[PDB]
Amino acid sequence: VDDAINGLSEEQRQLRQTMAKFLQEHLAPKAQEIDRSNEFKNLREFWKQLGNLGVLGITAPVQYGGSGLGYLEHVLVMEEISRASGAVGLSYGAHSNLCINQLVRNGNEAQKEKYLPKLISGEYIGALAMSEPNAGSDVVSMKLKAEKKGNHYILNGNKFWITNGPDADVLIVYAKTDLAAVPASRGITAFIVEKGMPGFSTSKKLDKLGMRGSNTCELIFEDCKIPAANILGHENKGVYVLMSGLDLARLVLAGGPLGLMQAVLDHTIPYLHVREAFGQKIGHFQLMQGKMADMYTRLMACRQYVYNVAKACDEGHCTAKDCAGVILYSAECATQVALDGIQCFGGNGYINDFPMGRFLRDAKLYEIGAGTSEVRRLVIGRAFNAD
Amino acid sequence: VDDAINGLSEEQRQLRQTMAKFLQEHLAPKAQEIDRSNEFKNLREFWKQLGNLGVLGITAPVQYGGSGLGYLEHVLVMEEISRASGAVGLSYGAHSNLCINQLVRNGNEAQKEKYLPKLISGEYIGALAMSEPNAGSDVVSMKLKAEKKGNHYILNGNKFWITNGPDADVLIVYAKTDLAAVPASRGITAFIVEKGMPGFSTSKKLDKLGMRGSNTCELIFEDCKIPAANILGHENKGVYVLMSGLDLARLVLAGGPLGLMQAVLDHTIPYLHVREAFGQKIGHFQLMQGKMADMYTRLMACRQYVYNVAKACDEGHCTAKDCAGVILYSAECATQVALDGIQCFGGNGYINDFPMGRFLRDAKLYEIGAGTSEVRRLVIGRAFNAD
Amino acid sequence: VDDAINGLSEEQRQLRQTMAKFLQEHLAPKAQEIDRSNEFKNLREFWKQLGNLGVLGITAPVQYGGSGLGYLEHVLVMEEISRASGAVGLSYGAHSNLCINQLVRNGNEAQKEKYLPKLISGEYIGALAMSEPNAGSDVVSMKLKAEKKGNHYILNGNKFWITNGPDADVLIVYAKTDLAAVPASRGITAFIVEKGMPGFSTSKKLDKLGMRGSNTCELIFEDCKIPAANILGHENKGVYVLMSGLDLARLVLAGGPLGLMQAVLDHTIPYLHVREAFGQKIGHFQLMQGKMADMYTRLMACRQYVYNVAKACDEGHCTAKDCAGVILYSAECATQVALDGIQCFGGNGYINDFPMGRFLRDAKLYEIGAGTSEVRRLVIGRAFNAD
Amino acid sequence: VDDAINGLSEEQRQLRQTMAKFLQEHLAPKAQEIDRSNEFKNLREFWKQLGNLGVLGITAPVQYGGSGLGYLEHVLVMEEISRASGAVGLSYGAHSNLCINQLVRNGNEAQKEKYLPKLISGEYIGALAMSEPNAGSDVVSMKLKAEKKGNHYILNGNKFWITNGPDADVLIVYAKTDLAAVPASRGITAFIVEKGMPGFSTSKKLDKLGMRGSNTCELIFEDCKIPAANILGHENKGVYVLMSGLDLARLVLAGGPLGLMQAVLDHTIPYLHVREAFGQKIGHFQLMQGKMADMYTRLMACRQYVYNVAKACDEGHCTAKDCAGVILYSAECATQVALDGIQCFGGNGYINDFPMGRFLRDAKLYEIGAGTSEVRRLVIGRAFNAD
Ligand SMILES: CCCC(=O)SCCNC(=O)CCNC(=O)[C@H](O)C(C)(C)COP(=O)(O)OP(=O)(O)OC[C@H]1O[C@@H](n2cnc3c(N)ncnc32)[C@H](O)[C@@H]1OP(=O)(O)O
Ligand SMILES: CCCC(=O)SCCNC(=O)CCNC(=O)[C@H](O)C(C)(C)COP(=O)(O)OP(=O)(O)OC[C@H]1O[C@@H](n2cnc3c(N)ncnc32)[C@H](O)[C@@H]1OP(=O)(O)O
Ligand SMILES: CCCC(=O)SCCNC(=O)CCNC(=O)[C@H](O)C(C)(C)COP(=O)(O)OP(=O)(O)OC[C@H]1O[C@@H](n2cnc3c(N)ncnc32)[C@H](O)[C@@H]1OP(=O)(O)O
Ligand SMILES: CCCC(=O)SCCNC(=O)CCNC(=O)[C@H](O)C(C)(C)COP(=O)(O)OP(=O)(O)OC[C@H]1O[C@@H](n2cnc3c(N)ncnc32)[C@H](O)[C@@H]1OP(=O)(O)O
Ligand SMILES: Cc1cc2nc3c(=O)[nH]c(=O)nc-3n(C[C@H](O)[C@H](O)[C@H](O)COP(=O)(O)OP(=O)(O)OC[C@H]3O[C@@H](n4cnc5c(N)ncnc54)[C@H](O)[C@@H]3O)c2cc1C
Ligand SMILES: Cc1cc2nc3c(=O)[nH]c(=O)nc-3n(C[C@H](O)[C@H](O)[C@H](O)COP(=O)(O)OP(=O)(O)OC[C@H]3O[C@@H](n4cnc5c(N)ncnc54)[C@H](O)[C@@H]3O)c2cc1C
Ligand SMILES: Cc1cc2nc3c(=O)[nH]c(=O)nc-3n(C[C@H](O)[C@H](O)[C@H](O)COP(=O)(O)OP(=O)(O)OC[C@H]3O[C@@H](n4cnc5c(N)ncnc54)[C@H](O)[C@@H]3O)c2cc1C
Ligand SMILES: Cc1cc2nc3c(=O)[nH]c(=O)nc-3n(C[C@H](O)[C@H](O)[C@H](O)COP(=O)(O)OP(=O)(O)OC[C@H]3O[C@@H](n4cnc5c(N)ncnc54)[C@H](O)[C@@H]3O)c2cc1C
C-alpha cells in the first residue's frame, strides 16, 4: 500500500492505483518469464498499451497527444513500473525520458512533429547513445566521427550499452563532428539516427547479469548518410544538450530503485508473517523487526527525497547535484534493502523460484547503468567548488 | 544555504530567515560558552525574547498568545535553534512540545488558561517527567505512587532524566495511582505540578557528554499535596496521553539532528576551501568530495523525510510508526555525519576550539534520548504485526 | 598472489600452491561453463582426482587412506577451491567435512572401516541431511521420524537443502526415534543411509540464484529399512552429534567467503590497471584506491580471523560462538566486497562474460546457508547469557 | 577475560596477565580523574614503575635496558595499555615506539647511549615531532628551515600536535635543511632535541575533545642551537628515516583501539546482565544479543589481524600497507563498537559518571590522529598501482 505522506495531490494518487492494477493484471505475472528468457515477446503490444493509457510522453507538452504533466507523475510511473518488473523499468526510462525529453526540449518544430506522433503512441522505440566501448564514464571522449559533405553527415564508429538497441526505430546518437577543437566538449553533436538508413546495423543482444529482458547490443556505423535536417540542437553544441539532459535522466531513473525496494518489502512482509519458527511467526523476532524497520525507513526516506526533488524541478528549479544525489542514495539504499530482503527469506530466497533473486541483480544496474557512484559523487563535489 | 526544494511556503521561509537572523546575533556567538560552562545565565531573558517572537507557543492556539501554526513550523524552529546551539534546541523542544503542546491537546480550559499564557510569554518553563532511575525504556513499569486522600493526591517517589528540571515552573509528571491493577498500562495518571509545592525538591544538575547547558536533575516527591484540579487527561487512564505525547515528541525533536547536520555542513563546506594540502585545496580531492556528497545527500534525505511526515500530521495523517522511523533515521544519519565532519577538518576537529566536537556529542543524545533506538525499531516492527 | 602474513608452515604452504596450479587448469577454466549449465559433468572424475591428491580425507586419520592433518589445511583448501569455483567449493566442503569428520568423530570401528576408504578415495560422495522444508534454522523441530520394526529402523519423512543429493552414495540423516520425551532434542538420532536402499530416492535438482552447478535436491524416504548397525553415535543421542558437527561445519565453510573475496580482488586489481578514463588509468583515482584498500583490509582481516580461530580448534579448545562469528563476518564482508568489486568493472561487471556476478551470487549463500546470519548472533549472545 | 585464541605463547600470556594485574589498582582506578582534569598527577611515578617492568624497552635489547622481544609483544602490551585508561595509552606509544625504537633502529652508537638509557629506564620521556600547522597530511611539505653555520644547526619554524610536548625530555624533531631541492623528500633531515636547549620552548597545552591526559602542545623554535652530532640518520636523507617509524607506529598503535574495544566490552557485558527491563534482563533481548555479537566479532577480527601482522614483522617481512590497514580497520571498528556500547547503556551511557562517552571520544583519535584514513587509503592505492 501507500500513504499520503508523499504529498501526492489529486490526479496523481489515482494514477498510482491505475498503474498498479494495470501492471498487476498484465506485467506482474510475466516478470519471471522475462527474466528467465532474457526477452520480452510482448514488447510492442505493451508499448502500444502504454501509449494508449497516456503514460508515454508524460513530460511532453500537449501538442501531439502528450499528457503535459510534471516530472513527479513520470517519477511515480517509473517507480510503479520498476516495482512490477525491474527489467521493463530501464526500458521505459530509456524510452520516455532518454529520447522524448531531448526531442521536446532541444528539438525544433519540424523535428518533434515527425517522430513524437509515432513515438508517444508506442510505435517507435526511443534509444539513446552516449557511452562507448572505450568510454563508459568519460562520455565527452567519444570517437564517433561525423564528416560533413554538403547537406549530409557520414558517421563511422561504434557504440555500446545501448538500451533497446535492435528494437529502436529512432535513436539519438551523439557524434563528434570536429575532432580538432581545443575543448573536447565543443566537438560533439547530437543526431537523430533512424532505422533503415544504409550503413546502420546492430549486434546480438548482450547476456547481462540483471535486467534480463531489456535488449542491449552494439551499434555499428559504416558510411551512414545522416541528413542535415536530422540534427538535434545546434552544431558543435551537443554538450549543452547531453549534460543538461543527463541530470533529468538520473532524476527520473531514480524511481527505479524506489519501486524495486517497494516490491522487496511487499514480498518480504507477508512472508515474515506466514513463515513460522520456534513456535511463532518469524516476523515477531526482534532481529526481523529491526530489519523491517530499517528497510521501511530507508524506503520512505529515499521516496520522499526523490519526490521532493521532482517537485522542485516542476517549478523550474533544476540542479545537477541533487538529480545525481537522489539516484545515488536510492541505489545505495535499495542494494542493502534487497540484501536484507533476501536474508529475511532464508533458504527460500536463494532459489530462482522467488523474485527475491531478481531484485538484487536489478538493483545493481542503477549503480553502473546510469553513471557510476564515483561520477555522481564527483558531480556533487564539483557543485561546491564552484561557489 | 537552504534550498527551496524542501517545499515550504513563503511565510515559512520568512520565519526560517527571521529565526536564523535572531539566533545568529544572540545565540550563535555564546553557543560555545554555554557548552564550556554548562550554564545559561541568560536563559530566562532568552526565553522572554523567544516569547516575544511567539515561537514558544507556535503550536498553541492564538487565544493564549500563541502563533497557531502547524507542526512543520515547529520543526523549522527546532532545526534553526539546534543549528546554533544543540542544548538550547533540546531545551526548546522539551519546553514547547512536552509541556505546551501537551496541555493544548489533553488539558482542560482552566488548566490551559492558568499555565499556557506564562509558558508562551516565557514567564514559566515547562518540563516532562516520564523516565525513572529503574525504568528508562519501560515507562509502564514506573513505581511513582500517587495515592489520594479527599481532593488531594499524595505523590511519593523519585524520577530521573528530567529536562529543564531546576528551572521549570510548571511540570507535567506522570504517576502510577493503582499498582495492583491487572492492566499494567491502565494504572498511570498525569499530574501537573508546579514550583512552590511543599515536597517538590529538585536535585543538582547532571554533567553529561553533550547538550551542556540544559539543566537536567532528579525530581524528589515526598508527601506532596497536588490538588485534584491539576490532572492531565483522565484518572487511572494516563497511558493514552503518555503515548500521544510520545508519538508527537519524536517528530518535532527530529529537527535537532537536522539542525546539527546543517551546522556541521555550514562549518565544513567553507572550511574545505580555506585549507591547503599538496598545493591544492582539500575540497578538490575526490575522497573529500565523496564525503561532502554523502553528508549532503543524507541531510537532504532526512530533511525531506521529516518535512513530508510533519506536513502529513497537519491533515490528520498521524502515525507513531512514521514518527519513530523519522527520529531513528535522523539520529542515525546525524551521528555518522558528525563523525565524518570531524575527519574533514583533520586535527582541527578534535579540540574544543572548534564546534565540530560539540555537535558530535549532542547528536548522540538523539539515539538514546526520548526512547532508545532499539525501542524505536521494536515499535516500528510491532506496527506491521497488526495488518 | 597471497602473502606470508597467514603464518602457515612450509608444509601448509605446499598444499596452498599445489591446489593453485591444479585448480587453475582443471576447475578455473570451466567455472563459467559449470555456472551457466548448472551441471558438473566431470563431478566424479574431479572427485577421484582430488581423492588422489588426498584433500578429501585431509582431516581423516592415516589408517583409512586419509592425510592426518588439521582443520587449517582443510580451511585453506576450501578457500582455494572456492576461489577457483565457489559452487564446487560448497560441494567439496559439505562432502568432505560433513561426512568424514562426522564419521570419524562418532562412528564405531565397523562404520569407519566400511565407508571411509571409498569416501576418501573419491568413489563415494557424502552429504548431511539435517534441514527440512519447514525447519531451516530450527533443526530441533524436524518432522522425520523413525520406528523400530524389530532389529530395523523404518525412516519416514523428507529432507531438503541437501548438497550433493543425487550424487552422494553415503548420507548422514538425522531422524527422531522418540517423540514422547519432554525435551524435543532427546528424540533426534543420526543414521547412515546408503544410495540405492529400498525406499530412498531423490525428487529433482533445484535451481538457485548462485552456486550453480552444485547439485541440490529433496530427499524422500518411503518406508526405508535402514539396518540397526547403521546408527551413528548412540540411541537418542543425535543432537549431541549434530551440534558437534554444526559447530565444525561453520569453521570449515568459512573459506568459501574467503575464497570469493580473494577471487574478486584477483580479478578486479588487474582490471583497473588496464582500462583508462579521462586520460589515465582508473586505478589512479582516489575513489577506486579507497575501495581497493577497504576490500584488501577486509579480506586480510577475515582471513587472519579464520586462520587464527582454526588453529585454536586443533589445540583442543573449540567454542560454538567463535565458529558462528567467523562465518558470519566472512560472509558479510565477502558480500560487501563483491558489491564494490562488481561496481569497479563498470558496465563490464554487469554481464555474464565476467565472473563478478557469479562471485556476488555465490557470496549470498553463506549468509543463508550452513545456518542463518540471525541465528549466529543469537548463539553468540546466548554464550554471554550463560556466564 | 581474554582467551588463548589470540595465538599468544606461554610467555606472552604471562606478560598479558602481569599487565592486567599491574594496571589495576594503579592505573585504571584513576582514569576518571585523568579524564575529568586532563592531568596526570603521578605520570612520572607510573613511568618509573613501567620502566622497572621493562615494557618501555619491550622491543629494545637488554644491552641498553630493554627486554629484547619482538613487535608482537609490543602490540600486545599496548592493548593492555589504553584498556584500563585510554588517556595514558597514547603517551606510551609516543614514548616507546616513536622515540625509543626510532633511536634503536636508525641510530649510531654514540646517540644510542646518551638518551636511550634514560628513556628505557623511565627517567626521561620521549616524543616524536613531524607534524606542523601547514603540514598535517602532506608531511613532505614542511616549512621549518634548518641553516648550517658549522657544527651546529639552527632550527627556525613552528610545529603543532606534538604528543607528550610539555613533559618530554627527548624530542625527535624533523626539519628541512634544503628548502630549494626539487624532490621534497630529499630535503628532510631528522634531529634530536633535549629539554633545556636555548631557543626551544613549549606552548600552552591543548584541551582536546578526547584522550585528555596525554599532553599535547605547540613547539616554538626561535634561533635554536643543536650540535651536528645529534643528527638522526643522515643529512638530506631523512626520507627513509621518516617513513620507517611511521609504519611501525601504525603497526603498534593499532593495539590502542583494541584496548578500547576490550574495555567497552568488559563494561557492557556485565551491565547487560544486571540491568533489567520489561521483567527480563536487557542482555537476553535479541537486539542486545546482536549488538554484543557484532562487537565481539569486530574485536576478534581486528585483534587477530594486528597480531598476525606483528608476527610477520618479527621475522623480516614488513609492509607499510598492512600496518596502515590494520590500524585504520581497528579504528573504524572501534568507533562503531563504542557507539554500540553507549547505545547499550541508554541514559547512563551519556553522563560523565560512566566511561562510555570517554571511550567514544578516545576512539575518534585513531581515525584522524597518527595519520588519517584517507592518507592510509592513498598509500594502499599507490602500493597496489606500483605492481
Ligand atoms: C539510465 C539508462 C541510460 C544511461 O545509463 S546513460 C548515462 C550517460 N552515461 C554516463 O556515463 C554518465 C555521464 N557522466 C558525465 O558525463 C560526467 O559526470 C561529467 C562530470 C559531466 C564529465 O564531464 P567532463 O568531461 O568532466 O567536462 P565538463 O563537466 O566540464 O562538461 C563539459 C561541458 O558540459 C557542460 N555542462 C556540464 N554540466 C552541465 C549542465 N548541468 N548543463 C549544461 N551544461 C553543462 C560544461 O559547461 C561544459 O561546457 P564547456 O566545455 O566549458 O564549454
Ligand atoms: C526533551 C524531551 C525529549 C525527551 O527526552 S522524552 C523521553 C521519554 N521518551 C521515551 O521514549 C520513553 C520510553 N518509551 C517506551 O519505552 C515505549 O513507549 C514502549 C517501548 C512502547 C513502552 O513499552 P510497552 O510496555 O510495551 O507499552 P505498550 O506497547 O503496551 O503501550 C500500548 C498502549 O498505549 C496505548 N496507546 C494509546 N495511544 C497510543 C498511541 N498514540 N500510540 C501508541 N500507543 C498508544 C495502546 O492503546 C495501548 O493500550 P493498552 O495498555 O494495551 O490498553
Ligand atoms: C553446506 C551447509 C551445511 C549445513 O549443514 S547447514 C544447516 C545448519 N542448520 C542450523 O540450523 C544452524 C542454526 N541453528 C542452530 O544452531 C540451532 O538450531 C539452534 C537454534 C541455535 C539450537 O537452539 P535450540 O533448538 O533451542 O536447542 P538448544 O540450543 O537448546 O540445544 C539443544 C541441545 O544441543 C545441545 N548442544 C548445543 N551445542 C552443543 C555442543 N557443541 N555439543 C553438544 N551438545 C550441544 C544442548 O546442550 C542442548 O542439549 P539438551 O537439550 O540438554 O539435550
Ligand atoms: C616517524 C614518525 C611518523 C609520524 O609520526 S606521521 C603521521 C601523521 N603525520 C603526517 O605528517 C602525515 C603522514 N604521512 C603522509 O601523509 C604521507 O607521507 C604522504 C605525504 C601522504 C605521502 O605523500 P608524498 O608526499 O608523495 O611522499 P611519498 O610516499 O611519495 O614518499 C617520498 C619518498 O618516501 C619514500 N618512501 C615511501 N615509503 C617508504 C618506506 N615505507 N620506506 C622507505 N621509504 C619510503 C619514497 O621512495 C619516496 O622516495 P624517493 O624520492 O622516490 O626516492
Ligand atoms: C522529558 C524527559 C527528558 C529527558 N531528557 C534526557 C536527556 O536530556 N538526556 C538523557 O540522557 N536522557 C534523557 N531522558 C531519559 C531517556 O528518555 C531515557 O534514557 C531513555 O528512555 C532510555 O532509558 P534508560 O536507558 O534509562 O532505559 P534502559 O532500559 O536502561 O535502556 C538500556 C538498554 O536496554 C535496551 N532495551 C530495553 N528494552 C529493550 C527491548 N525490549 N529490546 C531490546 N533492547 C531493549 C535499550 O535499547 C537500551 O539499549 C529524558 C527523559 C524524559 C522523560
Ligand atoms: C608524532 C605525532 C603525534 C601526533 N599526535 C596526535 C595527537 O596527540 N592527537 C591528534 O589528534 N593527532 C595527532 N597526530 C596527527 C596529526 O597531528 C594530524 O595531522 C592531526 O589530526 C592534525 O591535523 P592537521 O589539520 O594539522 O592535518 P590533517 O589531519 O591532515 O588535516 C588536514 C586536512 O586536509 C585534508 N587532506 C590533506 N590531503 C588530502 C588528500 N590527499 N586527500 C583528501 N584530503 C586531504 C585531510 O584529510 C584533513 O582533512 C600526531 C602525529 C604525529 C606524527
Ligand atoms: C548440507 C546442507 C546444505 C545446505 N545447502 C544449502 C544451499 O546450498 N542453499 C541454501 O539456500 N540452503 C541450504 N541449506 C539450508 C539452510 O540450512 C537453511 O536455508 C538455513 O539454515 C535457514 O533457512 P530456512 O528458510 O530453511 O529457515 P528459516 O528459519 O525459514 O529462516 C527464515 C528467517 O527466519 C529467521 N529466524 C529464524 N529464527 C529466528 C530467531 N529466533 N530470531 C531471529 N530470526 C530468526 C532466520 O534468521 C531467517 O532469516 C543446506 C542445508 C544443509 C543441511
Ligand atoms: C542509453 C544508455 C544506456 C545504457 N544502458 C546500460 C545498461 O542497461 N547496462 C549497463 O551495464 N550499462 C549501460 N550503459 C553504459 C553505462 O552508462 C556506463 O557503463 C556507465 O556510465 C559507466 O561506464 P563504464 O563503467 O563503462 O566506465 P568505466 O570507466 O568502466 O567505469 C569503471 C570504474 O571507473 C571509475 N571511474 C571513472 N572515472 C572516474 C573518476 N574520475 N574518478 C573515480 N572513478 C572513476 C568508475 O567510477 C567505475 O567505478 C548505458 C549507456 C547509455 C548511454
Check if A130 has its Cβ closer than 6 Å to any atom of ligand 1: yes
Asked if A4 has any chain B CB less than 8 Å from its own CB, the reply is yes
**Ligand 6 atom closest to D132 (CA):** 26
Q: Which atom of ligand 1 has the smallest separation from the CA of A375?
A: 18
**What is the C-alpha separation between C294 and C296, in angstroms, rounded?**
6
- Which residues on neighbouring strands pair with residue B194, listed in sequence order? B170
User: Which residues is C351 bridged to in the sheet?
Assistant: A208
CA dihedral D127, D132, D133, D138 (to 10 degrees): -130
Compute the distance from residue B224 Cα to the ligand 5 centre, in Å: 27
> Which is the closest atom of ligand 1 to the Cα of A184?
51
Helix (H, G, I), strand (E, B) or coil at D201: strand
Q: Which of B285, B287, B340, B374 to mutate to test the interface with C (most CBs of C within 10 A)?
A: B287
User: Which helix H or strand E contains C267, and what residues bound it?
Assistant: helix C255-272
DSSP code string of B279-307? TEEGGGSHHHHHHHHHHHHHHHHHHHHHH
**Domain limits of chain B?**
4-125, 128-241, 254-382
Distance in Å from the first CA to the final CA of chain A: 42
The alpha carbon of A157 is separated from its chain's Cα centroid by a whole number of angstroms, namely 25
Method: cryo-EM
> Domain B128-241 has what CATH class?
mainly beta
Residue with cell 559439505: C94
Resolution given for this structure, in angstroms: 2.9
Give the neighbours of chain C: at least 3 Cβ pairs within 8 Å: A, B, D
In chain A, what is the greatest distance between 2 CA atoms, to the nearest angstrom? 81
Contact A66, A58 (CB under 8 A): yes
CA–CA dist C207, C214 (Å, integer): 10
Q: What is the DSSP letter of D132?
A: B
The dihedral through the CA atoms of B169, B172, B176, B178 has a sign that is: positive
**Strands C280-281 and C276-277, sheet pairing:** antiparallel
**Cα–Cα distance between B97 and B244 in angstroms, integer?**
12
CA C137 to ligand 3: nearest atom: 11
> To 10 degrees, the CA torsion angle through D44, D46, D52, D53?
-140
Type of residue found at B147: E
User: Greatest CA separation found in chain B?
Assistant: 80
Q: Where does chain A show beta strands of DSSP type E?
A: 126-129, 145-149, 152-156, 158-163, 170-176, 188-194, 200-202, 216-221, 224-227, 231-232, 276-277, 280-281
D377 with C289: Cβ contact below 8 A: yes
Is A293 an interface residue toward D (CB < 8 Å)? no
**In chain C, which residues are last before a break of more than 2.5 Å from C to the next N?**
none
Q: Using alpha carbons only, how large is chain C's radius of gyration in Å?
A: 21
When the candidates are 3.90.209.20, 2.60.40.10, 2.40.110.10, 1.10.3480.10, the CATH number that belongs to D127-241 is: 2.40.110.10
Query: How distant is the Cα of B289 from the closest Cα of chain A, in angstroms?
Result: 4
State the greatest distance between any 2 C-alpha atoms of chain C, in Å, as a whole number. 81
What is d(CA D164, CA D172) in angstroms, rounded to the nearest whole number? 12
Distance CA C81, CA C68 (A): 20
3-state helix vs strand vs coil in chain B, percent to 5: 50, 15, 35
- Report residue D94 as a C-alpha cell: 609516543
B328 lines ligand 2 (CB under 6 A): no
First to last CA, chain B: 42
Q: Which residues, 6+ apart, have CB-to-CB distance to D14 below 8 Å?
A: none
Ligand 8 centre to CA of C366 (Å) is 30
How far, in Å, is the centroid of ligand 7 from the Cα of C134? 10
Long-range CB contacts (within 8 A, 24+) of C351-357: C351/A206, C351/A207, C351/A208, C351/A209, C352/A207, C352/A208, C352/A209, C352/C32, C352/C36, C353/A207, C354/C267, C355/C31, C355/C32, C355/C35, C355/C263, C355/C267, C356/C264, C356/C267, C356/C268, C357/A209, C357/A210, C357/A361
What gap in Å lies between CA C252 and CA C370, rounded to an integer? 11
Q: Do A324 and A250 meet the contact criterion of CB atoms below 8 Å apart?
A: yes
**Distance between CA A199 and CA A181 in Å, rounded?**
27
For ligand 5, is residue D351 a contact (CB within 6 Å)? no
What angle separates helix A71-84 from helix A286-314, to the nearest 10 degrees?
150
Alpha helices in A85-149 (DSSP H): 86-93, 100-106, 109-120
Residues of chain A in contact with residue B312, where contact means CB-CB under 8 angstroms, are: 3-5, 7
Closest of C121, C126, C65, C117 to residue C94, by C-alpha: C126
* 3-state secondary structure at position B318: coil
Amino acid at C140: V
Cα-to-centroid distance, A133 and ligand 8 (Å) = 10
Coil, strand or helix at C193: strand
Q: List, in order, residues 6 or more apart from B75 with CB less than 8 Å away.
A: B251, B252, B254, B255, B258, B306, B307, B310
- Can you give C173-185 as a three-state secondary structure string? EEEECCCCCCCHH
On whether the CB atoms of residues A215 and A373 are closer than 8 A, the answer is no
Task: Please report, as a single letter, which amino acid is at residue C354.
Answer: F
Question: Do the Cβ atoms of C89 and C255 come closer than 8 Å?
Answer: yes
Q: Tell whether the torsion through CA atoms of C352, A349, D295 and C5 is positive or negative.
A: negative
Tell me the count of B-C CB pairs closer than 8 A: 8
DSSP single-letter state for residue D204: P
> Which ligand places an atom closest to the C-alpha of B342?
6
CATH class assigned to C4-125: mainly alpha
Q: What is the CA radius of gyration of chain D?
A: 21
Nearest residue of D to residue B161, measured between CA atoms: D347
Cell numbers representing residue C280 in the block: 589515465
Residues in chain D preceding a C-to-N separation beyond 2.5 angstroms (breaks): none
Q: Is A280's Cβ below 8 Å from some Cβ in D?
A: no
Sign of CA dihedral C327, D309, C273, D368: positive
User: Half-sphere exposure of residue D312, counting CA atoms within 13 Å on the CB side?
Assistant: 20
Residue A166 CA to residue B342 CA, distance in Å, equals 51
Helices B71-84, B255-271: axis angle to 10 degrees equals 40
**What are the backbone angles phi and psi of residue B204, rounded to the nearest 5°?**
-70, 165
Measured CA to CA in angstroms, residue A148 lies from A145, A170, A201, C230 at distances of 10, 21, 21, 85
Nearest CA in chain B to C284: B286
Distances (CA, A) of C211 to A127, A359, C88, C164, C214: 35, 18, 8, 12, 6
Chain B residues with CB under 8 Å of C286 CB are 285-287
DSSP D314: T
Report CA-CA distances (Å) from B204 to B88, B156, D352: 19, 19, 14
Residues in Cβ contact with B11 at an 8 Å cutoff, skipping those fewer than 6 apart: none
Instruction: At A65, list the grid cell.
Output: 497527444
Going along chain B, which residue ranges are E strands? 126-129, 145-149, 152-163, 170-176, 188-194, 200-202, 216-227, 231-232, 276-277, 280-281
- For A128-242, CATH number? 2.40.110.10
How far apart CA C56 and CA C93 sit, in angstroms, is 9
Considering every ligand atom shown, identify the ligand nearest to the alpha carbon of residue C272 and give its number: 8
Instruction: Quickly list DSSP for A13-40.
Output: HHHHHHHHHHHHHTTGGGHHHHHHHS--
Closest CA to D319 of C302, C270, C296, C268: C296
Instruction: At C380, list the grid cell.
Output: 553468540
Q: Do A296 and B325 touch (CB under 8 A)?
A: yes
CATH class of this structure's domain D254-386: mainly alpha
Instruction: Kindly state if the Cβ of B243 falls inside 6 Å of ligand 2.
Output: yes
Q: Specify burial of residue C10 (Cβ count, 10 A radius: 0-12, 13-18, 19+).
A: exposed
Burial class (CB in 10 A: 0-12, 13-18, 19+), C363: buried
Q: Which residues pair with C194 in a beta bridge?
A: C170
Residue with CA nearest ligand 6 atom 34: B282
A78 φ, ψ to 5°?
A: -60, -40
**B217, exposed or middle or buried, with CB in 10 Å at 0-12, 13-18, 19+?**
buried
- Identify the residue among D285, D297, D322, D326 best suited for mutation to test binding to C, counting C beta carbons within 10 A and taking the highest: D297
Lining ligand 3 with CB less than 6 A are C 90, 94, 98, 128, 130-131, 137-140, 163, 183, 185-186, 239-240, 243-244, 246-247, 249, 320, 369-372, 375, 379
**How many alpha carbons lie under 13 Å from residue C17 in its C-beta half-sphere?**
10
- The DSSP code sequence of A24-82 is HHTTGGGHHHHHHHS--TTHHHHHHHHHHHT-TTSSS-TTTT-----HHHHHHHHHHHH
Assess contact for A255 and B342: CB atoms under 8 A. Answer: no
CA-based diameter of chain D, in Å?
Answer: 80
CA distance C216 to C221: 16
Using CA atoms, how far apart are residues D178 and D236, in angstroms rounded to an integer? Answer: 7
DSSP summary character for residue D53: H
Distance (Å, whole) CA B299 – CA B297 = 6
Helix axis angle for C86-95 and C43-53, nearest 10°, is: 60
B116 to each of B60, B371, C126, C249, how far by Cα in Å?
8, 26, 78, 66
Q: Are C286 and B285 in contact (CB under 8 A)?
A: yes
d(CA B353, CA B35): 11
Q: What share of chain C is helix, strand, coil (3-state, %, to 5)?
A: 55, 15, 25
| Chain B residue closest in CA terms to A306 | B301
* Residue given cell 609504519 in the structure block: D247
D333 to chain C: closest CA residue? C298
Q: Whose CA is nearest to atom 19 of ligand 7?
A: A347
- Give the distance (Å) from ligand 4 centre to CA of residue D243: 5
CB distance B104 to ligand 2 below 6 Å? no
d(CA C350, CA A203) in angstroms, rounded, equals 18
Give me the phi and psi of A2, to 5 degrees please: -145, 165
Classify domain B254-382 by CATH architecture.
Up-down Bundle (1.20)
Instruction: Name the burial class of residue B110, with classes exposed (0-12), middle (13-18) and buried (19+) by CB atoms within 10 angstroms of its CB.
Output: exposed
Q: At a CB cut-off of 8 Å and minimum separation 6, what does D55 contact?
A: D19, D67, D77, D92, D96
Asked: is C254-385 a CATH 1.20.140.10 domain? The reply is: yes
Distance CA A81, CA A255 (A): 9
- Distance between CA atoms of residues D140 and D161, nearest Å: 16
